[PDB]
Design an enzyme around this catalytic site. Structure first.
Site, PDB file in Angstrom:
ATOM      1  N   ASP A  69       0.821  -0.887  -0.341  1.00 22.54           N
ATOM      2  CA  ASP A  69       0.123   0.351   0.302  1.00 22.54           C
ATOM      3  C   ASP A  69       0.430   1.009   0.438  1.00 22.54           C
ATOM      4  O   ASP A  69       2.230   0.846   0.470  1.00 22.54           O
ATOM      5  CB  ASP A  69      -1.070  -0.230   1.279  1.00 22.54           C
ATOM      6  CG  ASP A  69      -0.325   0.358   2.570  1.00 22.54           C
ATOM      7  OD1 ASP A  69       0.551  -0.738   2.864  1.00 22.54           O
ATOM      8  OD2 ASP A  69      -1.414   0.458   3.671  1.00 22.54           O
ATOM      9  N   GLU A 134      -0.171  -0.821   6.734  1.00 24.39           N
ATOM     10  CA  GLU A 134       0.967  -0.041   6.645  1.00 24.39           C
ATOM     11  C   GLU A 134       0.212   2.058   6.353  1.00 24.39           C
ATOM     12  O   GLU A 134       1.378   1.832   7.708  1.00 24.39           O
ATOM     13  CB  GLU A 134       1.500  -0.810   6.117  1.00 24.39           C
ATOM     14  CG  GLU A 134       3.217  -0.858   7.474  1.00 24.39           C
ATOM     15  CD  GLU A 134       3.992   1.196   7.252  1.00 24.39           C
ATOM     16  OE1 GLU A 134       3.965   1.683   6.328  1.00 24.39           O
ATOM     17  OE2 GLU A 134       3.667   1.276   8.923  1.00 24.39           O
TER      18      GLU A 134
END
Length: 265
Positions: A69, A134
């Site tokens: 991500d 994250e």
């Protein structure tokens, strides 16, 4: 023809994995790891995807960890290049996640490919622990996966978190976890291997930090693993015009490969 490292890092940068969406980045990584003979377990927690992969059954279990991500781009008028279009300008690769941390992910995959090509019968085992959350509010994947592993007595010995640890030149600084948060016996095996690899590549020891680093790496450490954060220059993370020096990606890949050689070769 692009180096395999540059090619994969461009693939990953084109997928719009703004958190917690993944745009198939883990699927790309999983494809490459399947070819190498990793077993794969994709785990979904909340609406985020994660995976664990492992090749080999013997101790020590060495793991590459990271996330697919990225943060949103922010205002386009401030970008010189399209944030989700990997763009190569004078030896730098521009795009969201080039430094945090799709460039590192590409290096991990190409390192393990290269290491396996040379050492198919390596010692120990290689794992990947990849999350897609994250950079979001809700950072759950690493904790949930680590718990899953711990509950089946699958304990990670050593882990590289490929967050962008460096200041000016890749490998100038590494971050070292406290195993068990400072409370379990620590051989230094991992730190000595990553330092050896960094010196083999750069001909200079990295500077060391023993604090900071991400909550996920610190959780992996608390639970029992030796952890080191090593990755590219971090100047442009979470900024517009995020980029990474391509030659540093080539280096970083060699550093990863040399660590595997030290530990498992």
């Amino acid at each position: 023809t692009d180096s395999p490292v540059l090619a994969l890092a461009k693939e990953l940068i084109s997928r719009q994995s703004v958190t917690p969406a993944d745009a198939g980045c883990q699927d790309l990584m999983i494809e490459r790891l399947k070819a190498l003979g990793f077993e794969i377990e994709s785990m979904v927690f909340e609406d985020t995807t994660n995976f664990w992969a492992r090749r080999g059954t013997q101790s020590p279990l060495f793991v590459f960890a990271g996330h697919t991500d990225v943060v949103p781009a922010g205002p386009l008028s401030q970008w010189h290049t399209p944030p989700f279009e990997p763009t190569v300008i004078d030896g730098f690769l521009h795009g969201r996640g080039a430094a945090d941390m799709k460039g590192s992910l590409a290096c991990m995959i190409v390192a393990v490919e290269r290491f396996i090509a040379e050492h198919p019968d390596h010692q120990g085992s290689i794992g990947f622990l990849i999350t897609s959350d994250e950079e979001g509010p809700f950072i759950n994947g690493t904790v949930r996966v680590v718990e899953t592993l711990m509950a089946r007595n699958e304990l990670i010995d050593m882990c590289i978190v490929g967050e962008p640890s460096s200041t000016l030149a890749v490998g100038d600084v590494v971050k070292n976890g406290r195993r068990g948060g400072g409370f379990l016996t620590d051989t230094g095996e991992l730190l000595a291997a990553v330092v050896a690899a960094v010196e083999e590549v750069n001909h200079q020891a990295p500077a060391l930090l023993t604090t900071g680093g991400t909550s996920d790496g610190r959780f992996i450490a608390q639970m029992g693993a030796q952890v080191v954060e090593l990755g590219p220059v971090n100047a442009t993370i979470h900024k517009v015009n995020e980029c990474v020096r391509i030659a540093d990606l080539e280096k970083l890949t060699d550093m990863y490969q040399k660590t595997l050689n030290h530990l498992l070769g």
